[PDB]
Motif scaffolding. Structure first.
Motif, PDB file in Angstrom:
ATOM      1  N   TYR A 169       0.843  -1.194   0.000  1.00  0.00           N
ATOM      2  CA  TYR A 169       0.000   0.000   0.000  1.00  0.00           C
ATOM      3  C   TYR A 169       0.877   1.242   0.000  1.00  0.00           C
ATOM      4  O   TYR A 169       1.544   1.537   0.997  1.00  0.00           O
ATOM      5  CB  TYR A 169      -0.920   0.033   1.214  1.00  0.00           C
ATOM      6  CG  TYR A 169      -2.073  -0.934   1.196  1.00  0.00           C
ATOM      7  CD1 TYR A 169      -3.273  -0.607   0.578  1.00  0.00           C
ATOM      8  CD2 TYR A 169      -1.965  -2.171   1.804  1.00  0.00           C
ATOM      9  CE1 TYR A 169      -4.330  -1.495   0.574  1.00  0.00           C
ATOM     10  CE2 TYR A 169      -3.010  -3.058   1.804  1.00  0.00           C
ATOM     11  CZ  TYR A 169      -4.185  -2.722   1.188  1.00  0.00           C
ATOM     12  OH  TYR A 169      -5.217  -3.623   1.205  1.00  0.00           O
ATOM     13  N   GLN A 170       0.859   1.995  -1.097  1.00  0.00           N
ATOM     14  CA  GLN A 170       1.467   3.319  -1.074  1.00  0.00           C
ATOM     15  C   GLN A 170       0.603   4.288  -0.274  1.00  0.00           C
ATOM     16  O   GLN A 170       1.040   4.837   0.743  1.00  0.00           O
ATOM     17  CB  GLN A 170       1.693   3.810  -2.505  1.00  0.00           C
ATOM     18  CG  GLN A 170       2.359   5.159  -2.621  1.00  0.00           C
ATOM     19  CD  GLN A 170       3.761   5.180  -2.058  1.00  0.00           C
ATOM     20  OE1 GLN A 170       4.525   4.234  -2.215  1.00  0.00           O
ATOM     21  NE2 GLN A 170       4.107   6.274  -1.393  1.00  0.00           N
ATOM     22  N   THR A 171      -0.627   4.519  -0.723  1.00  0.00           N
ATOM     23  CA  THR A 171      -1.667   5.158   0.072  1.00  0.00           C
ATOM     24  C   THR A 171      -2.884   4.244   0.100  1.00  0.00           C
ATOM     25  O   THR A 171      -3.005   3.310  -0.693  1.00  0.00           O
ATOM     26  CB  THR A 171      -2.054   6.540  -0.480  1.00  0.00           C
ATOM     27  OG1 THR A 171      -2.596   6.407  -1.797  1.00  0.00           O
ATOM     28  CG2 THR A 171      -0.854   7.473  -0.526  1.00  0.00           C
ATOM     29  N   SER A 212       4.003   5.879   5.060  1.00  0.00           N
ATOM     30  CA  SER A 212       2.699   6.495   4.884  1.00  0.00           C
ATOM     31  C   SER A 212       2.202   7.061   6.205  1.00  0.00           C
ATOM     32  O   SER A 212       2.374   6.450   7.262  1.00  0.00           O
ATOM     33  CB  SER A 212       1.693   5.484   4.332  1.00  0.00           C
ATOM     34  OG  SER A 212       2.016   5.110   3.008  1.00  0.00           O
ATOM     35  N   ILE A 252      -1.214   9.050   3.181  1.00  0.00           N
ATOM     36  CA  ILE A 252      -0.438   9.990   2.377  1.00  0.00           C
ATOM     37  C   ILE A 252       0.962   9.414   2.242  1.00  0.00           C
ATOM     38  O   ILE A 252       1.631   9.175   3.253  1.00  0.00           O
ATOM     39  CB  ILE A 252      -0.379  11.393   3.007  1.00  0.00           C
ATOM     40  CG1 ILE A 252      -1.766  12.026   3.092  1.00  0.00           C
ATOM     41  CG2 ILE A 252       0.557  12.290   2.223  1.00  0.00           C
ATOM     42  CD1 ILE A 252      -1.812  13.241   3.956  1.00  0.00           C
ATOM     43  N   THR A 253       1.412   9.197   1.010  1.00  0.00           N
ATOM     44  CA  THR A 253       2.672   8.512   0.749  1.00  0.00           C
ATOM     45  C   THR A 253       3.628   9.435   0.005  1.00  0.00           C
ATOM     46  O   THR A 253       3.256  10.032  -1.007  1.00  0.00           O
ATOM     47  CB  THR A 253       2.426   7.231  -0.053  1.00  0.00           C
ATOM     48  OG1 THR A 253       1.527   6.386   0.672  1.00  0.00           O
ATOM     49  CG2 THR A 253       3.720   6.483  -0.283  1.00  0.00           C
ATOM     50  N   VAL A 254       4.857   9.544   0.505  1.00  0.00           N
ATOM     51  CA  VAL A 254       5.894  10.387  -0.079  1.00  0.00           C
ATOM     52  C   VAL A 254       6.942   9.486  -0.719  1.00  0.00           C
ATOM     53  O   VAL A 254       7.415   8.535  -0.090  1.00  0.00           O
ATOM     54  CB  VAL A 254       6.529  11.300   0.984  1.00  0.00           C
ATOM     55  CG1 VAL A 254       7.635  12.143   0.390  1.00  0.00           C
ATOM     56  CG2 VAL A 254       5.481  12.168   1.638  1.00  0.00           C
TER      57      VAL A 254
END
Lengths: 252, 59, 252, 59, 252
Positions: free
Chosen positions: D15-17, E59, E232-234
Motif C-alpha cells: 500500500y502506497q496510500t 505512509s 499519504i505517501t511520499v
C-alpha cells in the motif's frame, strides 16, 4: 474542450466550465441602427461601457414542487444603474441582450429546466373580462411564478404551466430561442437576443419587448441526505444600447 | 386523417438493460421526447383545421 | 474522444458513449466466399439487408451471486426473422457476426464481466457416461447458467465456472477474442467475429459454430440504497450471410 | 523446475496510500492480475509435462 | 489530456492519471557540477542507477484533526540503499531531488493539502533558551507532526501550524516551490528540486538541505458511510548525485 466559455462585456466577466453552446437569436448578432432604417433625426446616445454590462437579478429557489418563473425585459432593468437612468431620461430606446442563467447541482441531483426567450408574450387574464394590474405582469427584478392548476386571482395573469400564460401548448414553446439546463450535463444557458420589433426604436416603459421563461419539465429530485436549497440566478447584459429624445425624468 | 389504406406503423420502446444507479441517488427518472421533420418532407392539400370550433362572434 | 462509437447494419443502429474499442476476430474482417475456396456449384443467396441486421436476445439479471451465462450461436437465432427462415429453407450456411453486449450501472456500482467468444466450445456432461439433451446446450434466445459448485443434474452440462463447461482453466480462457465490461470505465463490449470452420460452408442446425460466454470475475456489489436490478442485454448481427442448397422447410 | 542455482526473485505488492472512498459506496474491492511474455522471450528444451497422469487406457 | 504523467528514474516508474503539472525548482533542472564551480580536486563518484531512483517513505494517516507533517531531506534517506551507504562512506555530497506525494480519495471526499519544499528551514524551539535534540528535527523516514496550539515540550520544536516552526505566516509560505493536492481535481504533486546551497558540495549529515512540508488548509471531511482511512505517501528520487572524499564509514 468547448464546454468552457468566457464572456466579457464591460467591467464584468462570466467564466463557465459546463456550458453547452451559445444560441444567437435568429442568426442575427446585435448591432447598431443604420441610417437607412432610421426614423428619428437627432444624434443618439451610445454609452457603451456604463450601460453595456452584466446586471444580476434576484435568485429564485427551486423546490420539488416549483412550476416556473417569468421576467419581462425592458422593465426588469428599470433600477439597474445607468441603463435604468438612460431609460428614464430618453423617449426612444433600442438594444439587444445577453441572457445568462446559472443553476448548479451535484452528480446526485436530477432535473431539467427550459430557458425560453419569447418575443411579444402578451399574457392572458385569470378572469376573462377583467383588467390586469401591472404589478403581476412584471415586478422588476422579482420573479412572477406560474401555478400548477387553474389560477383565478383578481387582476392577475392566468397562471398555468401547461398554457404558459399565453394559451398555447407549452411543449410547442421551443420555436423561440431556447436552451435547456439539464443537471447531468449543463450548468448554464447563454442566449444572445437581438432587437425585435415592428418599429426601429421604441419606448422602454410603455412596451414589453420579450419575456424570459424558466420552466422545469423534469421535476427536481434528490435523496435524503443531499442539499435542499438550489438557487437559480439570471444575469442580463444589454448590447448595442442607444437612446434618443432626451427630456426630463419620469414615466407618465 | 385516419384510413386503413395509408397506415404507417408503430413506434415502441423497450428495456435493453435496466437502469443501474448507485446508493443515495434517486431511482425513478424521466425521459423527454422530441419530434421534427427531415429535409425531404412535404405537405400537399390545403384544408381547414379540425381544431377551430366557434359558435358566435367575438364581441 | 474515441469512447463514442456508432454501428449501422441495415435499418438498426447502436450508439454507445462509453465504449472501449472493437475487437475484430483474429484480424480478419467478415467477407463473402471466393470462387477458389468454394465447393458447391450453384448460385448462393445474399439478402444483405433483410438478414444482416441487429437482433436483440433476452436480458438476463445479474445479482451478487450470479455465476455466468452462455449462448450457442448459430442456434440462438433460429426464430429471428428472415435469418432464421433462411436457415430453415437452405442446407448450407455461412456468416460472420457482430456481438454487442449492453450493461450499465452508475459510478457507485462495481463489478467486472468477461465477454468471450469461443469457437467449438464442445461441452462436458454432468454425469460422465451420459448423453446430454439439446435443451441444455442451447435454449435459443434464453440463456443457460453456470453454477458455483459441481453440478450433477441428469442429461445436463457440468456447470462450474472454474472449468467453463470445457474442463479448462477459466483464467486461461482469454486466448479467444474477448473484451471486459468493467463498470467503472465501460458500458459495452463489441466483438466482430468472422467465419471459422474446417469446411467452407456448413449446416446451421447440426453444427454449433461458437459460444458466447459472459462470466463475472469481480462480483457485483453496491450499497444499501443503490439500484438492485441490473440487466445484461446481448445484441447480434449476422455479417456477409449467404445460403446454399434450397429445399423444403424442416430439420430432420 | 526448481533449483537453488537459477533463482529469480520475488513479486510483492504494498500500500502506497490507502483506498479512500466516499459515502454510500462499497469499501472492499477486487484487483485482477495478468501475465504474459515480452518480445525477447524464449524456451529451449523439450520434455513431457508433469501434469499428465493416466493409469489405464480410455476405453 | 495532460493529466496523465509517467516518470522513469532507474528501475522504478510512477504512472499517475490525475496529475496537475510538474514544478521545476526556480526554473533550473538538476545537473552535475562543472569544472569552473568546482572546489575539490579528486574524481567524484557517479553511480547513476544504483543511487538515482525512487525511494518510498512511510505512509502517514490523515484524520479530520490532522495538522501537518515535515521531513528533513538529506537525512530521511540515511537508511535507503546505496544512496545512504554512499552518504556514509563519503565526506561531500551533492544532488537534486524529485518529490512525488500520493494521496487518493473518491469524488465524495473533500480536502486540500499544500506540499511545500522549503530550503534552509531552520526551526525554532518550544522553550526559547533551550537546545533541540536531533530526534525531533528529523526522525528519518518517520514524519514529525505539527500541533494545532502552542506546544511547549522539552527539547522540541515549537509545533504550531500558523507559524510553520519558523515564525512566519503560513499563508506566505507559497514563495517556495509548491503544489496543492486538492481532492476534487488532483491525486499527486510532483516537485523537481535542484541543488541549493552557499557552497558547491556539502556534507549530508551535518547539514539539512531542505524540508518538505505537507499542511492541510481545507480540513478533511466526509460523510457517515465513506472510507475513514486515507494515507499519504511520499516518494523521493535523488537526481545527479555525486560523491567526494572517500574514507571509512561513520558520522562523528
Amino acid at each position: 474542450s468547448d464546454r468552457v466559455r468566457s464572456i466579457t462585456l464591460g467591467n464584468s466577466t462570466i467564466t463557465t466550465q459546463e456550458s453547452a453552446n451559445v444560441v444567437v437569436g435568429y442568426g442575427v448578432w446585435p448591432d447598431y441602427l443604420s441610417d437607412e432604417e432610421a426614423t428619428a433625426e437627432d444624434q443618439p446616445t451610445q454609452p457603451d461601457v456604463a450601460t453595456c454590462r452584466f446586471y444580476t437579478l434576484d435568485s429564485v429557489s427551486w423546490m420539488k414542487e416549483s412550476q416556473g418563473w417569468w421576467w419581462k425585459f425592458p422593465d426588469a432593468l428599470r433600477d439597474m444603474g445607468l441603463f435604468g437612468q438612460n431609460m428614464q431620461y430618453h423617449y426612444l430606446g433600442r438594444s439587444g441582450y445577453t441572457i445568462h442563467v446559472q443553476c448548479n447541482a451535484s452528480k446526485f441531483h436530477q432535473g431539467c429546466l427550459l430557458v425560453v426567450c419569447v418575443p411579444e408574450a402578451e399574457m392572458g387574464a385569470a378572469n376573462i373580462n377583467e383588467k390586469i394590474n401591472r404589478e403581476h405582469l412584471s415586478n422588476g427584478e422579482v420573479a412572477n411564478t406560474f401555478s400548477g392548476t387553474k389560477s383565478s386571482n383578481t387582476n392577475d395573469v392566468q397562471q398555468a404551466v401547461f398554457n404558459a400564460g399565453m394559451g398555447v401548448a407549452v411543449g410547442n414553446l421551443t420555436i423561440f430561442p431556447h436552451q435547456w439546463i439539464n443537471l447531468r450535463t449543463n450548468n448554464c444557458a447563454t442566449i444572445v437576443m437581438p432587437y425585435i420589433n415592428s418599429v426601429p426604436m421604441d419606448n422602454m416603459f410603455r412596451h414589453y419587448n420579450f419575456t424570459l421563461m424558466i420552466i422545469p419539465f423534469a421535476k427536481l429530485d434528490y435523496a435524503a441526505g443531499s442539499s435542499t436549497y438550489i438557487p437559480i440566478t439570471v444575469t442580463v447584459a444589454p448590447m448595442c444600447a442607444e437612446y434618443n429624445g432626451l427630456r426630463l425624468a419620469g414615466h407618465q | 386523417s385516419k384510413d386503413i389504406y395509408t397506415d404507417a406503423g408503430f413506434i415502441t420502446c423497450w428495456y435493453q438493460t435496466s437502469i443501474v444507479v448507485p446508493a443515495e441517488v434517486q431511482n425513478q427518472s424521466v425521459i423527454l421526447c422530441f419530434v421534427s421533420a427531415c429535409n425531404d418532407f412535404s405537405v400537399r392539400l390545403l384544408r381547414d383545421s379540425p381544431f377551430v370550433r366557434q359558435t358566435a362572434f367575438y364581441q
